[PDB]
Structure 1
Amino acid sequence: DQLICVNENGGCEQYCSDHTGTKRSCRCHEGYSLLADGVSCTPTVEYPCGKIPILEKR
């Protein structure tokens, strides 16, 4: 059983989960969805947590 998340957060932008074998699943906080790259998180809502709208709209 490989340990993947211990290393650079498994490549995940946000959250990382280890699964049996060399399997890794990245996850996101609520208000975000995972991109098809399986690592990046994109907002699903207008005001996702931890993003500053006046700076995001710049």
Structure 2
Amino acid sequence: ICVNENGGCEQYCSDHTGTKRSCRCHEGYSLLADGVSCTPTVEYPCGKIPILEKR
């Protein structure tokens, strides 16, 4: 599943038993109930530009 369009994940993707797929996030982010989207849990998460995010 992960092989194609990142298994629908925003960040990381893990394959399991058959057609089971788990999305995950980098440290400083948590996964939303949709199971694909990652939301920041910290003030300065990695790979996001505060001055651009604050517009």
Question: What TM-score do you get using the length of structure 2 for normalisation?
Answer: 0.98
Cα deviation digits, residues 1-58 of structure 1 (max 9, x gap): xxx1001000000000001011000000000000000000000000000000000000
The count of corresponding residues between Structure 1 and Structure 2 is: 55
Percent identity among equivalent residues? 100
Stretches of structure 2 lacking an aligned partner (at least 5 in a row): none
CA RMSD between the two structures: 0.4
Q: Residues 1-58 of structure 1 correspond to what in structure 2 (within 5 A)?
A: 4-58=1-55
| Partner SS, residue 37 of structure 1 | coil
Question: What TM-score do you get using the length of structure 1 for normalisation?
Answer: 0.93
Spell out structure 1 runs of 4+ moving beyond 2 A: none
